[PDB]
Amino acid sequence: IDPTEQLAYFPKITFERLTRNYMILLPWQHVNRYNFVFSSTGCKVSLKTCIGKLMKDLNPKVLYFIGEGAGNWMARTACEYPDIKFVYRSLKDDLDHHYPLEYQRVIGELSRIIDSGEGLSMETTDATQKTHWDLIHRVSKDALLITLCDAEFKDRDDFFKMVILWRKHVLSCRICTTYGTDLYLFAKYHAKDCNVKLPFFVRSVATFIMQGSKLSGSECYILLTLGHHNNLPCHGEIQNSKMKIAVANDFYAAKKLDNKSIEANCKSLLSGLRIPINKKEESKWLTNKANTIIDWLEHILNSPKGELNYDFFEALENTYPNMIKLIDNLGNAEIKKLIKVTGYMLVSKK
Amino acid sequence: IDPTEQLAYFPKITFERLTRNYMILLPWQHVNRYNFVFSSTGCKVSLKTCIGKLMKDLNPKVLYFIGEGAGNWMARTACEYPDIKFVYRSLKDDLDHHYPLEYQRVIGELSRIIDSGEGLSMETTDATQKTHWDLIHRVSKDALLITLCDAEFKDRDDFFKMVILWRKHVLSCRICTTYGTDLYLFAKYHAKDCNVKLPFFVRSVATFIMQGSKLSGSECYILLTLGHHNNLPCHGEIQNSKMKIAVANDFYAAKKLDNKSIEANCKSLLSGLRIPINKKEESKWLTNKANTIIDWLEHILNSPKGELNYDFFEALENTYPNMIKLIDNLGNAEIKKLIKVTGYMLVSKK
Ligand SMILES: Nc1ncnc2c1ncn2[C@@H]1O[C@H](CSCC[C@H](N)C(=O)O)[C@@H](O)[C@H]1O
Ligand SMILES: Nc1ncnc2c1ncn2[C@@H]1O[C@H](CSCC[C@H](N)C(=O)O)[C@@H](O)[C@H]1O
Ligand SMILES: [Zn+2]
Ligand SMILES: [Zn+2]
């Protein structure tokens, strides 16, 4: 139940601040996330590593987490800083997690989350709605020193709607205004448009590019404060930083592995067993989906041990026939689950 | 959506009214129930076959169904009599179905169920509680001409608690009393104690022994009316009637087979495909449970075609090694699902 002891199940995070390409089809950023089931985002972004000096400078007693889904990012934060309380908000709908199901799993209980948002309307859970930020202090009367946002907006221009609303709150809140300009919002951002100017009095301190970010996108985490408005990054800038990481850096695997989680993800993709190789250095009964799953994992089993980097991952994709049959027959949720189980196999090899 | 056309998915019911034994381990009474998923009871008992002449004599416009789980018995009744409305009650708890999920499936909608019991307490859903029978006319102001009970009471002596309560209602109900003694309760009964006398003024018209009843039990359906109280059956009497059926009679299979249901039950026991035999007259990747499932179904595939009766079923059990490994490794819900899929395979053979 000790928070600092649970961090051993979390992997070492590599990031970068602000002609060789890989061409892969699988979400390989999920290799070192085998120890997690409902949410996975806690493995790509970490507060102690990315904005650790900022957490020292302004010691927040309460952290405000918006658009947090299953709460894995919040969960790692609970392990990294075992004396910090949390305020949780995530969009209330059928399609996504609106309860910290992963936090509850790795931490044990919701005691440290003083306000989980239990008993709130669809409107008061949406970061793009004024009433959400109005009811943010409904329990915690602590200022929004550091506000974390990981919301995956359907129309990406909703990012701005919540940025303006964050600004509007910190500049019109009895609690927050007593801290001045030294208030930060660490939000996930996709570069839909190049060199876009931030709303009035919103400044980008730093742009963070994650190793655990999907290689094909333009996803980055930007530290926002109150100050003279500047331009946001662009697809190009992020893409070269993302690519530079993939070549040089290798994916770090969690020091300790949670067997209960490994087995959870296994049962989750398909109800069938994983095998250790006997090397010591018909399948007609399964459905088309169940076969493609086992056949990929068989290829991983038969494949030798290699460094956990996009060089070796590209090789595993190029050494497998029916790669396109695979990506078509398995949904985005299944392929992500697949890589968690694949990464475990690759870590447990030799 | 036509009720009479949906009866083709229901199997022909064989029953009996009131030294050779089989020794089987699997619930074979589930062979002809491949077309059903949430509930299965509709295949062992039918009103048009068992008490068809009684439904003619007193034409009920509304039928009262208590302890009905997923509502498959009610569903077959809807097909057998396409102009009858229903009142539904089943115990409200987490462990069992308290909504007619199977009726909704085979019929399409809950339009014919005038009172599904939606918005009732745990107490008003329990047949052993006075308030249940008090709120029975909360919608339907039609007398309890024929009341059907299939409740699977934890302590079997709760059967009497509801029988006395049924009596107490029909003899103290403004609506019901206007019909006199000619009121019937068709209830499931287990012979816990031999020759037990029914409560005062409750008479057993007939005792019904089903082919689709579990061979090892003492389950029977007894038609109860208001009259001089008589004795209930006993384990012995039922057992010889149950055995007499198993020897002579063969299980009738549904004329038409619902592919959507067959596939539902398949996915339900394990997420893997069923194969047609190519005769034209490693498995290390699966878990211990998934293997025992496939290995049994492989034995059924390799086995020749035979009559759907306990003679052939005993033979299939005696021709299979690890029969005890099977019954231990698979729960009562899984083995029941297994036989539904087994029966489909046996029906689809040659
Ligand atoms: N407009 C909006 N306002 C608030 N939350 C939103 C939103 N649009 C999407 N979301 C939330 O954003 C989430 C993206 S996933 C968040 C994962 C999280 N960082 C973790 O590690 O657990 C979704 O689950 C959804 O509930
Ligand atoms: N005391 C009680 N009062 C009412 N219902 C009860 C009960 N004890 C058990 N039950 C119900 O009895 C059901 C037995 S299964 C009923 C299946 C039904 N004939 C069909 O074909 O769909 C359980 O689902 C449970 O909800
Ligand atoms: Zn505030
Ligand atoms: Zn009445």
Numbering used by the authors:
A (entry chain B), B (entry chain B): 1616 to 1633, 1648 to 1910, 1937 to 2005
Show sentences the authors wrote.
The Mononegavirales order groups five families of monopartite, negative-strand RNA viruses many of which are highly pathogenic and/or contagious; the Filoviridae (of which Ebola virus is a representative), the Bornaviridae (Borna disease virus), the Nyamiviridae (midway virus), the Rhabdoviridae (rabies, vesicular stomatitis virus (VSV)) and the Paramyxoviridae (measles virus, human metapneumovirus (hMPV)). These viruses encode a large RNA polymerase (L) (usually >2,000 amino acids) that is crucial to viral replication. As a part of this study, we expressed CR-VI+, a 406-residue fragment comprising CR-VI and the adjoining ‘+ domain’, the variable region carrying the K-K-G-motif, investigated its MTase activity and solved its crystal structure. Both the CR-VI domain, which assumes a fairly standard MTase fold, and the K-K-G motif of the (mainly helical) +domain are required for the MTase reactions.
In crystals of the monomeric C1877A mutant (space group P3121), this disordered, unstable region is further enlarged, as helix α+2 completely unfolds and α+3 unwinds to 3½ turns.
